[PDB]
Design a protein around this ligand. Sequence first.
Ligand SMILES: [Mg+2]
Lengths: 191, 204, 113, 123, 197, 203, 187
Amino acid sequence: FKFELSNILKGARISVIYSGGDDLFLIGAWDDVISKALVLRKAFTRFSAGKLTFSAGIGMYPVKYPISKMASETGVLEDLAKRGEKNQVALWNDSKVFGWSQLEEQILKEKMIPLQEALTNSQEHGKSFLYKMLELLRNEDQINIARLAYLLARSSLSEELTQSIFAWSQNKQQKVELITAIEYLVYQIRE
Amino acid sequence: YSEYLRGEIDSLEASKIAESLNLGKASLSTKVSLQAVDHNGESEPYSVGNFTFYPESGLYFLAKGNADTIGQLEILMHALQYSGIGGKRSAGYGQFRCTIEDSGKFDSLLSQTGNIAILLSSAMASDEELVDCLEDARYLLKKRTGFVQSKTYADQLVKKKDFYAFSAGSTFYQKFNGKIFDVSDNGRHSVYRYAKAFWLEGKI
Amino acid sequence: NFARKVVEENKRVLFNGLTTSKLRNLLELINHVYTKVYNSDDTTLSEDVRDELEYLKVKFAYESGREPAVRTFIEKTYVDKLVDVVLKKNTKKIFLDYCKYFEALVAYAKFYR
Amino acid sequence: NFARKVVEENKRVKDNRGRQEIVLFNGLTTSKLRNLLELINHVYTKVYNSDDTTLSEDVRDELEYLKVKFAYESGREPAVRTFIEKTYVDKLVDVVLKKNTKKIFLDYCKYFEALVAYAKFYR
Amino acid sequence: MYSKIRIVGKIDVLTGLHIGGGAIASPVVRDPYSRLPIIPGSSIKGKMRSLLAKHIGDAPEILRLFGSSQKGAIQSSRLQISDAFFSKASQEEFDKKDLAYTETKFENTISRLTAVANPRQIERVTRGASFDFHIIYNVENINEVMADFENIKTAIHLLENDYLGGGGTRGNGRIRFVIDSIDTVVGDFDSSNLSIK
Amino acid sequence: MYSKIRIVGKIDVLTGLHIGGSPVVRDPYSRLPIIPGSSIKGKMRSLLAKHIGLIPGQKMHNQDAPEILRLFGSSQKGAIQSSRLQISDAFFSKASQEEFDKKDLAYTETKFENTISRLTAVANPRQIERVTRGASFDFHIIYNVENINEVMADFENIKTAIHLLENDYLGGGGTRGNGRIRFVIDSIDTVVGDFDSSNLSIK
Amino acid sequence: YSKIRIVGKIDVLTGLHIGGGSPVVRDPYSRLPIIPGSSIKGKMRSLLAKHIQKMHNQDAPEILRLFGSSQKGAIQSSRLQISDAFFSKASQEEFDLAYTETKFENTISRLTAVANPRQIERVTRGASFDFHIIYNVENINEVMADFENIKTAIHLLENDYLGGGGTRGNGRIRFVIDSIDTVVGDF
RNA sequence: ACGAGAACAUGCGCGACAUUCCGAA
Ligand SMILES: [Mg+2]
């Protein structure tokens, strides 16, 4: 905790408020924070030989946000992650408590990367189209699934990608991952 | 409750109880102040931390006293529904409706006798009772602070004297009767801090 | 759903070569009648709306006669029989359900293209 | 509309030299009916332009010419005569003249369009 | 002795209302639990205070109405304006017609130099919506009730001719007040003669 | 003593009006075509700025003439000027709705265009939604009387803006024959205050 | 910045045909045929560009100056605004004779000589449309030259057709200018 | 005599710029 964290977090916009005992408090750029949280999980799995697991809470706040509120809400997220198997990471709210491999692979390496690569070609980066996808995904109507299918048809992107997105939205526990990936991409392309 | 006092609540049961509370959602509303804009200035945002209750959730409490005190509290609560409790009452917070009734479910517990006493309110005893009521006690000191909300206490708004009170849930083997302390510092009127003890007896 | 099943069954070219340009007239008539119903606040379809639905049915027949792809679309999707059902029940909810069914049909047809 | 049964009765199937023609009558050619169809087209375009709730006198004169053309077409081919007999177009033009209203004329035009549309669909 | 008058009613959204506050471009403020659009009581209080300050012109009457923290003359706020929540009748009406509670408005900004339109998305509350508003007037002095209520009437008139949130100079936030009831809930004061709007 | 002047009236469409939202903007509640007040305010401000005079190398709307900043508002730090003109959304009028229900119009039309390449001469087709010519919209404007002495002059400016808008379009591609409109003012009355607005006019 | 209005008449010498999605373009409100301003603007722009590229936004500088340009970094406002030409009320009263007539073309093939008849709806000759054009004075000095170009375009449009198949006798028109006045400004 | 009292998430901002429903008989 007191030595290896500096080596792990190398080359990231991150300040370590504390690191000792078994707890850890980091504040930085949100994308850097999530990437280094995944890297820390991997390095901790390597260090403890798989015998020890840790849970995490990641909050995203504006600058000038109350620091006490930041700490309290991130602690609430962490305590949310410490439930049941308690080997989880909470992301930005109580409805995004994922597993570590689920967040790294099933959310970022599987859903966010293909969509980001496809939407980089778009002139507007797909901000409005991603907003429409979020609007359609939040609702839970079958006719709205039809609207989502029409939007994917009119997206003018890879057909296999539209099929994958439609399947992901159809499946529960994969629609939450899809929504998280869409929101992460929206945050990445913004001002 | 009693099962917890007898030690028959497991750690998993404690976690289930903790997650079974369905009070509500705490949020932070960001507001702005445009008063400086009209004076060639800038807007000043601020934050108000609110808590909204679920449709059938709320806050209850127990009142003890004679018939006259109970009736006066009925009128006071009826007016307090529209006065509001908490922070920005005049800015759209703290409005509620209250119902006052009997409590058989709580009279079953308040008639219970035991070897330990549990505080149901933030209380503290005078020195004479504090001499003998603190043995084998398990408590939690809370620092009661704040500004005096009054239009006649002084010219400008000032804080009241720092107070320290035992928390709710503190267990004592001696039941102390608290009082209403004065946290006023040479003001026009005496600012009161209620620290009387509402007790719940139990078996450990 | 049913629209997904029928569009998948007719997918190979969809509905023997159906496109949105073939359907555009029926879509325009359907959304015009839909907006006229939407503006009104009544549980029952009015008389002029009933006559407009009869006109929509005859337009369905005319488009089926004109094009083979439109004809097989109408035959497979039961849209004319659904219009008859809406006329028989004369309920705004049933008409809105039929409009949603048609919209889902068009959306899925565009999706599998 | 109720033109479905009329067109169903008026619909027949022809076969010759291994070729199966789905035509209601032998003489029910699209142009032969289309002459009167375009006469009614002129009539109802004039009605649309006028935008009056009553059937105009000039529309009434073109309509009388329409009845003359109906008799002309009945004389021209027995198939058109039998179609007109089955559909009773003469009774509809008579009611259109008598009640003398735009809505009745529009309903009759829609019914006749329904007849021709069902005929085309059954082909 | 001490009186409190309850003024309940409806705020009808004449034009799309945007009060700032998943990922949505310029989202509106919402109830944390029901995720329903709301009109914060602070917004209404501040807008009416600004309109009344423009009308009268802080002035003493503004201090009586909306309270003051000024040193020496600490005034209690006579008006407690609660948050306006999405009406239940409007909720049922919007559940019918399959209409969402909030709409997305697309706007341009044409540059004065390159003549290039920058797009921008905002969120508004749909024009058919209504909000249940609840106000408590505290009678700290009985002699100023008429003056306070005529000031409230002037503020409500100005607000009905003004907007309530967002950019209303570009056709947003127009609202109308319908006063369902004005009844004295606390005390003996007779509010039958009193009226707002 | 605050004064608000209420100018109500009709915007009568002369050529098909297309304000994008190629569909047009519609009020979600009534599903009728709408004219956003942002469009009207922006077009009026742009026309008035061009007519009065545009500073060379101008980049922000806050660098407009003092009259434009006085009327349509400025957001420059320190010199924050509140906009006197509040242009509301123009909703599809009920009279036009009744007139369109007769003769069975759909409140809207689809116009078919094509783009012909200079070399290949290939006409790529397209469709744009427009508001029918006979349609009318209820326009509502609120003028905030902040300075008395600058009321009349300000109204003159507004009049000029209207005189530029009647000779211009309102949305979509009006250089190709869209968005042409006419303003007919039903009333100009002092809705709030004691101001005398009888002599004021913008057309 | 002055707005000059050109108001006049376009009288068709042959069958005017604009192929609205063979029907002709009609105003939904009045059910009368109209000449879209987009058609006129495109015809004048094409003829003037021919008299004077893949992107269609390159053209020649006078073309972008007059009819507008969406060039990246060189967005030029269009000084010419061509509005929809609506059927004249005087011509409508003169016809009150259908406004539009159908023309039949056999379209015989070459090798097999098999006719494939078709019908095209075209406005009858002698019909008139009131046309309205707006010119914005962006620069005072160039206006003369701009109007010169405009005149040339008009001449070309009088020698050419407008909409439909003009190589077979469609779309021929004539321009009668009524007045050219500075409606807005002091020009 | 309620960590309380005062505090508008608000000011500026056109969904707009170029586009022949055209070649063919
Ligand atoms: Mg720890």
